[PDB]
Amino acid sequence: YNVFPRTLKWSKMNLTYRIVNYTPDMTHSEVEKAFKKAFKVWSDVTPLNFTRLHDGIADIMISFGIKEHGDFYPFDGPSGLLAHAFPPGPNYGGDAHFDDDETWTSSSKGYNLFLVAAHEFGHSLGLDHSKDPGALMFPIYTYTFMLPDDDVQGIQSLYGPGDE
Ligand SMILES: O=C(NO)C1(CS(=O)(=O)c2ccc(Oc3ccc(Cl)cc3)cc2)CCOCC1
Ligand SMILES: [Ca+2]
Ligand SMILES: [Zn+2]
Numbered sequence: 001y002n003v004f005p006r007t008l009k010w011s012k013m014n015l016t017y018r019i020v021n022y023t024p025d026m027t028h029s030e031v032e033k034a035f036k037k038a039f040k041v042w043s044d045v046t047p048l049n050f051t052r053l054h055d056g057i058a059d060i061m062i063s064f065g066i067k068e069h070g071d072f073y074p075f076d077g078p079s080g081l082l083a084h085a086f087p088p089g090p091n092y093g094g095d096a097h098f099d100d101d102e103t104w105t106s107s108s109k110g111y112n113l114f115l116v117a118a119h120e121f122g123h124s125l126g127l128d129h130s131k132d133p134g135a136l137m138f139p140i141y142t143y144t145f146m147l148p149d150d151d152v153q154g155i156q157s158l159y160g161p162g163d164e
């Protein structure tokens, strides 16, 4: 027999992600690089491994949309909500949605995709918001990068340190 896990977390170390569509604001490669770096933030401190899928069903489906986009959490246009992600689980579990009414960038202008993605992926992996103002999982955007200790402690509580 098996009882459900004590916390929402993936039961495997190898996860896949798929970039369903792209934002008008950046090139495909910029977006792909931002997401790759965002995942590396977490794989670097755990035994987690991320492989990108070009199509099909991935553990973490990533998309850009506006207003009502297929869930109970519609976006709100410019500003306000920037993005949201679902904790580990079936179907939409792990999925991360970014508001395409925001101006996404690979620099300090608008909202840096790498930073917001890194925070959202924390959610996709099982982390909720932290109270520590210096944590990546703090619910308010700040532009900067080294994963704060609070986040390291949180993700390792779920998956372990991996090598080192
Ligand atoms: O946190 C969020 N999504 O994860 C919500 C806030 S949000 O959309 O403004 C948002 C999303 C991502 C953010 O990313 C960062 C958080 C901390 C830092 Cl250093 C950098 C980036 C910061 C703020 C949206 C959904 O409801 C809960 C709050
Ligand atoms: Ca918005
Ligand atoms: Zn959504």
Ligand SMILES: [Zn+2]
Residues within 6 Å of the ligand: 119, 120, 123, 129, 139
């Ligand atoms: Zn958040």
